[PDB]
Paper text:
Calcium/Calmodulin (Ca2+/CaM)-dependent serine/threonine kinases (CaMKs) constitute a family of 81 proteins in the human proteome that play a central role in cellular signaling by transmitting Ca2+ signals. Kinases in this protein family are activated through binding of Ca2+/CaM to regulatory regions that either flank the catalytic domain or are located in regulatory molecules. CaMKII proteins form large oligomeric structures. The N-terminal kinase domain is tethered via an autoinhibitory helix and a calmodulin binding site to a C-terminal oligomerization domain that organizes the enzyme into ring-shaped oligomers.
The discrepancy between the dodecameric (12-mer) structures determined by electron microscopy and the tetradecameric (14-mer) assembly revealed by the crystal structure of the isolated oligomerization domain of the C. elegans orthologue prompted us to crystallize the oligomerizaton domains of human CaMKII isozymes. Here we present the oligomerization domains of the human γ and δ isozymes that were refined at 2.7 and 2.8 Å resolution, respectively. While isolated domains of the δ isozyme were tetradecameric, the CaMKIIγ oligomerization domain crystallized in its dodecameric state, thus providing a model for the oligomerization state observed in full-length CaMKIIs. The oligomerization domain formed a hexameric structure with a diameter of 120 Å and a height of 60 Å surrounding a central cavity of only 17 Å. Thus, the main consequence of the insertion of an additional subunit per ring in the tetradecameric assembly is a considerable widening of the central cavity, to about 33 Å. Each oligomerization domain in the ring also contains a deep cavity that has been suggested to represent a peptide binding site, based on structural homology with peptide-binding domains present in nuclear transport factors and scytalone dehydratase. In support of this hypothesis is the fact that a glycine or an acetate molecule, respectively, originating from the crystallization solution were partially occupying this putative binding site in the structures of the CaMKIIγ and CaMKIIδ oligomerization domains. We used the structures of the dodecameric oligomerization domain, the CaMKIIδ/Ca2+/CaM complex and the structures of the inactive catalytic domains, to construct models for the full-length enzyme.
Numbering used by the authors:
A (entry chain E), B (entry chain E): 386 to 520
C (entry chain F), L (entry chain F): 387 to 520
D (entry chain D), K (entry chain D): 386 to 521
E (entry chain A), F (entry chain C), I (entry chain C), J (entry chain A): 385 to 521
G (entry chain B), H (entry chain B): 385 to 520
The structure:
């Protein structure tokens, strides 16, 4: 195995798990969510109003009160992802997320956000330890 | 050495280098900047308008045309930093940056931004591989 | 016969652009996918300054809007211009006025400026790129 | 593979020429501009206010009164270009353009625009026949 | 015969009458009346055309199909300070201000002003509107 | 016929040429040229008249005395998609879009669009503008 | 003189009473009363006429047909600081501020101010409003 | 009757000429001319009086002292669609639109529209403005 | 003196009590109570009078007929930092800030501040409000 | 003696005169005149106090030191529709609208309206302003 | 060290009680609220419009008409608290409060406020004597 | 003597708060640091919703504004209220009106609401916390 092919595989490994995380969010599967996220997950994101939050407590609200409750359609597009492999057990993904969705008044709309996720493999499982979202 | 004290030291290691990076930016020292940044540095930041940029090319403009040129005072404050140690050679810092500065019309002002920097130690030197800034 | 040749090809590109727009208005995704290249790229307002692979991105508007709509709309194509770029390539630029009826009862117009790039593969014209501003 | 390498080369051909066109615009070289553009160039762009213009007449103004005038720095970045090769003599490039520049108030700013250029090779030279720009 | 002046008065009145009839047909949503008074090649500049020149017969269909016909709501049109240029035996041109009193969605009554030019061509004894320019809002 | 279509083409071009000359006269601030091409009874709807119909010769004097003649700053006018209605031997009508590139107060170059109607009347062998309707921001 | 000052007072009062009666007719939606008090040639400058001078009798019909009549919502009109110019035996002129308290769509009560001029002409022993200028 | 229609025309013209002369006096900043044409008891509703009725002669002094005089910047006034009501031998009333072309602070030329009412009273053979209502 | 300071304190409290009662009457929509505490010549500057001085008894009738009496919705008034000027045996003056907590149209609770002056005149043993100045958003 | 009515007229005029003198002292930036006419315990509600009641003598010093004194620029004050309440031999109260014509920074002349209440107390033969309420803008 | 552990304990004491106060407010328990607050509590807060209020009277309204009324979910997060121990019987806490909640339009939203509470222990019970809230 | 005691301590806190404000207005940082606890924390508008260690954060305003300023300013303290929290602790809440002169010539007012918490250590009152809204 060349290190080029090796690097491609690892990079794909991080894309797949990032995509699964996003699926768990969209479906409102908090058990899947907690399984993929490190319990010490920290987050910068618009809803946290410029503060760094412990993501596991702060995100419970969106699952209890929105994401599981919805059956309205939403299509997520991940654009131009870039993965930094930082040794055997650490990685980092930066990507643009376009989300098509339907608004309360019925119309369909799009939103863009720019997202960073930092990944740590512990005991054979990749876990998200940090998340930065802007939009 | 307990792993608690060990972890504290590594965490401090990342704070010091993040602070030095910020000093190099404020002074407009691009040579210091390039020494601390990985050549493959990627960045999400307000000036990149929602796109991911190769940070070394995109940042040259701010050094050539602003940061070295200035002697106007600026005080940076780093608030509530949080460091994730992700194995021997990988780390990640999230912090709030308050910058006090003087505006073109003379008045002093403050700006807040929320910042993530991902770090990789290669050949004994810590290098910044990703940067996410919102504000 | 050289000039008349050019006229014909130009009209060929207008007809197919017009059919594409009919497919969109009727919410016919099968017609749409038959006229669009599977690798279609798009710049457009709903993509928020990004270039998208148009076939995945457009599915949403067919599933959730264009097919479930009984409301009248009249499209007007203004001042089209066609560049014939060899036997198998062309390019159309036009203004699109759309008359429609809005939420609060009333009728409105929107203008957009549109570029479509065309490629003939195995005798069928296919849209490979689309740029929309408005 | 060689089918593939061929395609890669053509695609790079169109990127190089697009980049050269942009250099000509930034430097205010109208002679270089007119050499790279088809005389029948059409344009959709923000300054044309929703109209399609014949780009060679409409663009003269910006060369005469702006682009040739300026020694103010500007860095252009081309992000995520995509090229469609549409046969031996036709191609098409879509890209995002970020422009770093300096404003009247003194300060540096960024602008994004999304750009389509359509290309036609006539007598061995690639010429831009259509241009669609959106932004601001 | 008649005074050159009284002749001119007559013609001018002719163009006012026909312009007024056109406006009635529009208000009543009478498309057949409308098409009878408009040249099939009518061109139009108007707010709803967003700065473009449109072939008025296709572009106006939409407002008859979806608004003007189907309306029960009262509207009073006032034509202010019309001016007619008689441009030979078979050509004329009218410029006028149109105030429209009407009732709005939230119930209330409102006024709108628009400034309007209509160019007229008599073909086979019948005056037809060939161009229309409307500005307002 | 072959001869007739060609005749119509020529008259249409006649009206474009004179409209273009009128625009040159305005750009250059040549009021004498302007008054020679305009009917003394010219009426105008235009943004600077604020919804009113004005007698154009008096109203336009101000812009010639205080702006158009004084001006050394560059301006490029583009006429888009003109359409001419020939309304008999002595009457015509042109509708066009005018893009004007120009340089502003803070130094920068800008564009403005306006949609324009001019009505024409040939008197004693000379085409004269009798009405003008201009709409734009 | 003393009995010319009292004479002037009376005439001024005459013009206030008739102006007040006109306003009552408007508030009640009584168009017959309105047309009896207004000259058929009444001209009007007012906010609903959009900067134009209108023949008031045709233009006001709309507000009687479609609003002032079918109203039963309360409204209190206050006339502040009236001033009357007596311009000979048969002509006068009143300038006044009108405050109107009323109830809005949201159910809330509101006030509006307008400044009003009415010009009066006595023809055949009856005072008639010939002109009206309202701003607000 | 025929010679009452011509009589009416003349009087109406009389009122336009004097209104035009008043405006000339205002544009030139001639306060002496102004006070000769206005009744000392002139009242005024106008935008600069902020919804209040002012005694026009004291309130207008400020604009003559501080503006209309020391002006040499060009201004072209157009009076559109005047309408005159003759209210007996000694009273009249004019309603008109005033377009004013002028040059602004930035150096640019601009237009303003205002709708104006002037009420006139002839005392001792001279027409005097007793009331003024301006909106815009 | 000891007795004098105490005298002044009592009169000041007299003026606060009656101001508070006036405010109760307004909140409850009791117009008879209101008219008993107000001088019939009461003048008022207040936001709803739009910069004008009004005769308060006529102007305030509207708010009693159409709002204050109809109202079942809760409101808490807070009077902050009152200041009383005793201006002789029969005249006084109170300035205070009024915070009003209340519930709005979209259901939510809100606060409004206003700054208020009331001038008082004792006639025949009864304090009456003769002037009122209210300022606030 | 004098008519109860003529007596009342006199007193009312007394309060207008003194209010006018206060306004002149303010316009001229005469602080010594100002302090002579104002009670040392003067309280004020006014726009510059941002909804607070201030002790007017300390708060107004700033405008005399830094503005009203040092001004050469013309200003015409108009007092409209004053109303005076005579509240016994030694107490009064005036409500009036103040229109101020003035010249602005960018050169131009402007008007401002404010609605004003002044409460007056005669002590030792001299009328002194004890309270001031100003609303506007 | 034990000097230090002592300080840590007191600081936690003040966090627990502050958190309990916030629970009482969210649940709309006024009885619990009045037990934790000094009767002389003063407050600076957005709803008091720049004024200092006696918090016990002013806060009654929100309990009567809002907080006790609601079964709509809300999650409060206290970020980066800082406690000053100011002697045996006085303390002071500064913290950021993020509140996740659901709005009228249906949607969930966040609000930040910065909060200071000053504490006084009287007869063995900690009481809030002052409160300063900034935000929105 | 119990009530009079309370009055005195309350006035003690007003005087020192007033001195603090004088130090700020004059740009006297040495006076400022002598009256402020080195661990002073602050909530204030220029901190953008964050809690800052006031001694580092305030240095900038002294270095670049408060000392280099000859322009007049009048501070008014309205309706102060002092809570005495034992022998060594107190707390003051007040409204601060500041009259000042602005860039384009003119004079203006600003209001802010201010809390300062005080701790007496070794006989000297020190500000430990500061909350400013406006």
């Amino acid at each position: 195995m060349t290190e080029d092919e090796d690097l491609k595989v690892r990079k794909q490994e991080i894309i797949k798990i990032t995509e699964q995380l996003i699926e768990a969010i969209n479906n409102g599967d908090f058990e899947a969510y907690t399984k993929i996220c490190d319990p010490g997950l920290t987050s910068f994101e618009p809803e946290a109003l410029g503060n760094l939050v412990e993501g596991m407590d702060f995100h419970k609200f969106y699952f209890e009160n929105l994401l599981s409750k919805n059956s309205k359609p939403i299509h997520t597009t991940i654009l131009n992802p870039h993965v930094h492999v930082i040794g055997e057990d650490a990685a980092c993904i930066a990507y643009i997320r376009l989300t098509q969705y339907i608004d309360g008044q019925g119309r369909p709309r799009t939103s863009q956000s720019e997202e960073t996720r930092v990944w740590h493999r512990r005991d054979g499982k990749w876990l998200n330890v940090h998340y930065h979202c802007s939009g």
